[PDB]
Amino acid sequence: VNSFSGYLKLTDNVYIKNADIVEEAKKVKPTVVVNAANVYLKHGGGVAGALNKATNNAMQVESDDYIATNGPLKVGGSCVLSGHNLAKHCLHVVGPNVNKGEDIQLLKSAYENFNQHEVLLAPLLSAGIFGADPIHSLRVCVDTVRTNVYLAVFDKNLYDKLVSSFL
Numbered sequence: 001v002n003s004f005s006g007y008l009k010l011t012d013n014v015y016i017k018n019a020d021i022v023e024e025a026k027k028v029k030p031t032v033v034v035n036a037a038n039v040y041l042k043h044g045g046g047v048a049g050a051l052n053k054a055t056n057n058a059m060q061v062e063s064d065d066y067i068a069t070n071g072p073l074k075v076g077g078s079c080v081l082s083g084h085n086l087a088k089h090c091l092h093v094v095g096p097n098v099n100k101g102e103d104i105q106l107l108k109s110a111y112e113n114f115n116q117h118e119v120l121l122a123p124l125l126s127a128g129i130f131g132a133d134p135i136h137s138l139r140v141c142v143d144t145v146r147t148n149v150y151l152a153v154f155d156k157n158l159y160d161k162l163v164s165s166f167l
């Protein structure tokens, strides 16, 4: 038993809700919240900009130190950093950005990072400003993640299309 509430169960291990991931994080305080990161951990907009704003820019300060030490992530890769006031940990995962021409096959590799964590609160990778089809992203999630994932979808209209079209 865990503290996530109001989710629709899609599969044995995947759940979905219309929610603001920032507000969901602050209420649940999950062990892991997933950020829709880029390789530079520049949290300017989308999910990343919202999460970072909710940390009063502490996420960005921590991220800049991480990059200065380690260099950029790989597309499809991830790193674990602090969850600040939102979660114990933040798993920064880089899905491919179609608006940068990155290969969509890397979306499966991105979701594989979730399997290193027993339970996660997460957005749909590569959705939103990353330019992928969220219906495809949900399919890859279901077919790749084996751990327990709670998907927050900000847009109510999108949440309903994802549910109604789910196979």
Ligand SMILES: CCCNC(=O)c1ccnc2[nH]c(O)nc12
Pocket (backbone or CB within 6 Å): 019, 020, 021, 022, 046, 047, 050, 123, 124, 127, 128, 129, 152, 153, 154, 155
């Ligand atoms: C709506 C298209 C892309 N989706 C997001 O950007 C997103 C998802 C979940 N929670 C969020 N909170 C926030 O500000 N944006 C989001």
